[PDB]
Amino acid sequence: SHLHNTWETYESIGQVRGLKRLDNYCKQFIIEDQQVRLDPYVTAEDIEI
DNA sequence: GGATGTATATATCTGACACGTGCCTGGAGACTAGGAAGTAATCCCCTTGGCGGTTAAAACGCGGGGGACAGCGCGTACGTGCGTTTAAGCGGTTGCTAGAGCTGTCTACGACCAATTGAGCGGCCTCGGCACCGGGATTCTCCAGGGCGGC
């Protein structure tokens, strides 16, 4: 019901359904997050949008 | 004592039957010409059952090795499942144009018919080339004379 959302960890989950949803989330969100944070070719407009 | 399950009755929806109308296409009746059925003659091909001789193909047997098939391992590539994206499917706008259908007019083009004649089919004579026969030129095998040796 979107109210029992819990702050979990990889070792706190074990093996449940939809683990690869979290894998895609963590993986590619952290890849472009660290990519745009470590790129020197980043303008102010892109980071603010 | 209250509400629920179930039966019969009434209004509405929907496919099907019959009525109506046009129209145009099929049917009835009559006439005519020619397509095809029938006839006779001639000639060549096919049928059935044989014979004779050649000969190359078919059949049979046998050895052997090449290839088909089975089994096993392996690794890769395709199936399967899930999450995400994306584009198909539907409904919609807005004008213009292509095309089917219908009507109308007309003109060039093709059917049709008669006379003609020239291109297609058959045979005949001739030439180009290949082949058969007679005559001249060139080269190969052979018989005889001269010289030498032996008793």
Side-chain angles (χ1 to χ4, degrees), chain A residues 10 17-29:
Chain A
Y10 263 93
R17 283 176 286 274
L19 259 303
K20 63 183 180 294
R21 304 167 179 251
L22 190 153
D23 291 331
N24 292 117
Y25 180 95
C26 175
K27 177 181 71 173
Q28 62 85 29
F29 279 164

Side-chain angles (χ1 to χ4, degrees), chain A residues 33-44 47-48:
Chain A
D33 274 341
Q34 80 207 13
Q35 195 263 332
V36 70
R37 282 308 152 87
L38 286 185
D39 200 5
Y41 279 54
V42 169
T43 182
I47 195 74
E48 65 90 18

